[PDB]
């Protein structure tokens, strides 16, 4: 579960609040 040199980092939806960019890319 390392994302150095990868193309997509896992951002948890629990931190997205009301940021629409976050919700667009986050993972549960």
């Amino acid at each position, epitope marked *: *579960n*390392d*994302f*150095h*040199f*990868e*193309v*997509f*980092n*896992f*951002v*948890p939806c629990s*931190i*997205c*609040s009301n*940021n629409p*960019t*976050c919700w*667009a*890319i*986050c993972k549960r």
Partner: antibody
Amino acid sequence: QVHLVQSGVEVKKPGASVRVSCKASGYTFATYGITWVRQAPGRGLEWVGWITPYNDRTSYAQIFHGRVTMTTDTSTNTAYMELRSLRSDDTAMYYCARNHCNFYHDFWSGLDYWGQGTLVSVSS
Amino acid sequence: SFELTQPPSVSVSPGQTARITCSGDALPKQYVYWYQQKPGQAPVLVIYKTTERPSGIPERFSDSSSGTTVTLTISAAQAEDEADYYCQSVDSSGTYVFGIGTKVTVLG
């Protein structure tokens, strides 16, 4: 397949401001941060700060507070660093680089891909 | 932020082993990253997460730990290894710290 491409050389007078862009390709821009690092001629690497687009949060080294603004434009997948009130000793190569926060293991990453650098020269 | 201490310069004879240390009281809890910067080029990540070598970096480059000190070892040093080497770490709040950079001269 990841590329960061920066804008060209800037020659500015003292007191002016400069904006440098950093255009990303080859990855999901909104899941990584963009870091800026500065290098004066003959000197070492100086962290400027980072910006994460998924929460618009920024962290700058204290010396740049009030003078630097980082923004990201997720519609053009471009990051920007603006530096205001330029002084001769702001002359430096400015790099953008890709970082991220590993949420599984809760650590901030190294800088794996780098832009080519933008030279900003300040003089009258 | 916590400091990272690396020597300002290291000289190595061609084909011999260079050792560049990076010390900080926070290193037992944080990863170290090493960047190589050759003259006129952007920095390149050569070691990450303290022990990992990206694909494409020569196997001559390795990193070990010992207390609060990390050592980047360049075995059988080649003229093309002459460069500035920066160590780097971060704290848990996201502040990034670079060492001063070590100028490694491959001294013919």
